[PDB]
Design an enzyme around this catalytic site. Structure first.
Site, PDB file in Angstrom:
ATOM      1  CG  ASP A 136      24.649  47.450   3.555  1.00 40.30           C
ATOM      2  OD1 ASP A 136      24.987  46.317   3.936  1.00 40.30           O
ATOM      3  OD2 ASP A 136      25.130  48.018   2.549  1.00 40.30           O
TER       4      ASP A 136
ATOM      5  CB  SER B  91      31.642  30.273  10.461  1.00 39.48           C
ATOM      6  OG  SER B  91      30.895  29.078  10.632  1.00 39.48           O
TER       7      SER B  91
END
Length: 330
Positions: free
Chosen positions: A35, A199
């Protein structure tokens, strides 16, 4: 040193991925959910409340000659989905894919929430976010990667998740045969303890690319792609009959649909998520309403590039003094 381990979907939907991890002496192999959105290595154990164990493999520290109680240490974690676990702490030898760390904090669960009990395939989590998020008290502990880093050939790990197929986690090296083209690297902020990056935009299907900054985290421990409501609405508007369902808890779409792809930007590069990666199947057995793999982050407080996004790429988690993230097509 290096390590290399195969990671395997837990079910036919890729709801999560499990990776075998050797703990203790002799080795006890548990299948952990790696994770990159948390920083605790915790396991089902011989200390876990009996009624809360249902099929998981447990770690038994009393059977490990290298286990030592970390005296006075406790831990307690709550995840974004509402799941949780807590307990006490041992140190022991932990190996992943041939890479060994001695003195790793292994957090033994005394209690786990229902969601963990009900999933027999996940024996615990191995956190790979920054150690500043580790929950051990009163002495915070380091992640497996943080402990391994100085010994690694290069201070990196890579995630290469498969679509409905196994993939690979590598530690200490970049497998140049595992991706196509070049790797595009992008800046990381560690201020919130995550692999947080920005992004450069998105496209839906064959549509034009929208240049827009989307701050979010690279999170292997989250199944879906969670993005701003504007972006998610633009995606689902291209699927006839798709709608946001308050009763189901997100966007659903007719199972008869052909889903468009979704592209996200990494600098000037582009990662394309095929439409099929966005299908999470019937909302309930036999239903013709299917659950979407792109969902709104509104009310989470952060955008999450979970497995739906990451499995479309070869992803480099660069833990150099100034960390960065790399993405390549594959």
């Amino acid at each position: 040193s290096t390590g290399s381990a195969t990671t395997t979907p837990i079910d036919s939907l890729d709801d999560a991925y499990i990776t075998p991890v050797q703990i203790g002496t002799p080795a006890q192999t548990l299948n952990l959910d790696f994770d990159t959105g948390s920083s605790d290595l915790w396991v089902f154990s011989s200390e876990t409340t009996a009624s809360e164990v249902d099929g998981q493999t447990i770690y038994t520290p009393s059977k490990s000659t290298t286990a030592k109680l970390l005296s006075g240490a406790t831990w307690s974690i709550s995840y974004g989905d509402g799941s949780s676990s807590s307990g006490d702490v041992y140190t022991d030898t932990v190996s992943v894919g041939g890479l060994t760390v001695t003195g790793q904090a292994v957090e033994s669960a005394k209690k786990v929430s229902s969601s963990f009990t009900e999933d027999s395939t996940i024996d615990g989590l191995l956190g790979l976010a920054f150690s500043t998020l580790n929950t051990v008290s009163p002495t915070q502990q380091k992640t497996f990667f943080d402990n391994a880093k100085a010994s690694l050939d290069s201070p990196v790990f890579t995630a290469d998740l498969g679509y409905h197929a196994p993939g690979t986690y590598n530690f200490g090296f970049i497998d140049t045969t595992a991706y196509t083209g070049s790797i595009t690297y992008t800046a990381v902020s560690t201020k919130q303890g995550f692999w947080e990056w920005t992004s450069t935009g998105y496209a839906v299907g064959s549509g034009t690319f929208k240049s827009t900054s989307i701050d979010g985290i690279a999170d292997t421990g989250t199944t879906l792609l969670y993005l701003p409501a504007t972006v998610v609405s633009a995606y689902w508007a291209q699927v006839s009959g798709a709608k946001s369902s308050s009763s189901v808890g997100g966007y659903v779409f007719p199972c008869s649909a052909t889903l468009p792809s979704f592209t996200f930007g990494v600098g000037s590069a582009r990662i394309v998520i095929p439409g099929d990666y966005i299908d999470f199947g019937p909302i309930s057995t036999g239903s013709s309403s299917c659950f979407g793999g792109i969902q709104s982050s509104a009310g989470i407080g952060i955008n999450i590039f979970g497995d739906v996004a990451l499995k479309a790429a070869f992803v480099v988690f660069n833990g150099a003094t100034t960390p960065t993230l790399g993405f390549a097509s594959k």
